[PDB]
Design a protein that fits this description.
Chain B: Homodimer. Chain B: The modification Phosphoserine is found at residues 2, 13, 28, 64. Chain B: This is Adenine phosphoribosyltransferase. Two copies of one chain form a homodimer. Chain A has six helices and nine strands; from the N terminus they run αββααβαββββαβαβ. In chain A, helix 1 (3-9) packs across helix 3 and helix 3 crosses helix 4 (71-77). Chain A has one domain: 3-Layer(aba) Sandwich (Rossmann fold). Chain A has helices at 3-9, 29-33, 35-53, 71-77, 133-144, 163-167; strands at residues 13-16, 24-27, 59-63, 81-87, 95-102, 105-112, 121-129, 148-158, 172-178. Chain A has 179 residues and is α/β, with parallel strands linked by helices. At the A-B interface, helix 2, helix 3, helix 4 and strand 4 of A face helix 2, helix 3, helix 4 and strand 4 of B. The structure holds adenosine monophosphate (2 copies) and chloride ion. One adenosine monophosphate binds at residues 22-25, 65, 125-133, 162 of chain B.
Chain lengths: 179, 178
């Protein structure tokens, strides 16, 4: 299978029972630490996105905090800027926020109101898709700026969690899948 | 310097955020303008090569806004990026370090296996203010017996004497405000 995709897959480290028993934590750290693995990940994402959307993409939106690690590089590769979707309380100026369910409690994401103008087309990036709550909340916020979410993408997807279905009808793509 | 102007023109200031008195320096417009972002990373990367040649082994990006620059800076330099995170995010054995942030305490963490003794690291974050965050990152790295060659940022608030706080570790910023 794809040699570039293998550079990424080999650099995913799986930690059982973190944070809780029975959960397998997928750690993307080694992808970052290996310059050829990171270059491979950004390349595969970028090639997917240009092939799927051509010139439609206006900005990449990176999710706080591990999507920050990929969004700017992905955006740079596509010749685009990167806008930021943060945990609530961290961005100055006018914002929109959206509450969502995260593990056992509620969290809040926010965006600056001037991050995007109506009609602008975005692709959302994070490291991993699990339940899809975080991506879904990001999609909500972007939709409220009257931006169009073309797709959400991640390095890893946990398929038994049906995060994909939660995002439908917004398309989704992952480099790698685990149950 | 037209390159430095590209970054300077895209820092936005917000008085009295998060708390009255703080003038927040927002790097968001740098990220949004691909020429500005490319300029910030190039200026940092040129400085670091001019100052350290090929002695740098890794960039360390600090959670969370250093994450926006770390990977790109590391790639431009041909290096990997290690992560220094806010505590409770990393799996496997870690160490952590407390520091004063606002009116209380926060902690940064690193995996015990993030680096090997003797490996040489440059830490990046968006902005240096008091230097508490950067100083905790240096502490962590020194606890892994890594050598911190320098810390770098886009913005430095000079009245806050973050540079002195990191001394004798060298520091470089693209832009300075009081
Ligand atoms: N098993 C896992 N391993 C690593 N990160 C995870 C895992 N499950 C969820 N996450 C993180 O939690 C968020 C995804 O949660 P969700 O909103 O359920 O898709 C993302 O920020 C992921 O980085
Ligand atoms: N005026 C400011 N504007 C933007 N970020 C700030 C400001 N002051 C502190 N920070 C953030 O707080 C951390 C630096 O604080 P310090 O630990 O005091 O250097 C960095 O992670 C910065 O991103
Ligand atoms: Cl709101």
């Amino acid at each position: 299978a794809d040699s570039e995709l293998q550079l990424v897959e080999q650099r995913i480290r799986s930690f059982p029972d973190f944070p809780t028993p029975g959960v397998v934590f997928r750690d993307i750290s080694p992808v970052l630490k290996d310059p050829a693995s990171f270059r491979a990940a950004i390349g595969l994402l970028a090639r997917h996105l240009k092939a799927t959307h051509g010139g439609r993409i206006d900005y990449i939106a990176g999710l706080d905090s591990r999507g920050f690690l990929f969004g700017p590089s992905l955006a740079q590769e596509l010749g685009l800027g990167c806008v930021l979707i943060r945990k609530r309380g961290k961005l100055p100026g006018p914002t929109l926020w959206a509450s969502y369910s995260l593990e056992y409690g509620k969290a809040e994401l926010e965006i600056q109101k001037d991050a995007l103008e109506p009609g602008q087309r975005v692709v959302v990036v994070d490291d991993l898709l699990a339940t899809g709550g975080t991506m879904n909340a990001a999609c909500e916020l972007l939709g409220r700026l009257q931006a169009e979410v073309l797709e959400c993408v991640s390095l890893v997807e946990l398929t038994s969690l049906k995060g994909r279905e939660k995002l439908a009808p917004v398309p989704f793509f992952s480099l790698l899948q685990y149950e």
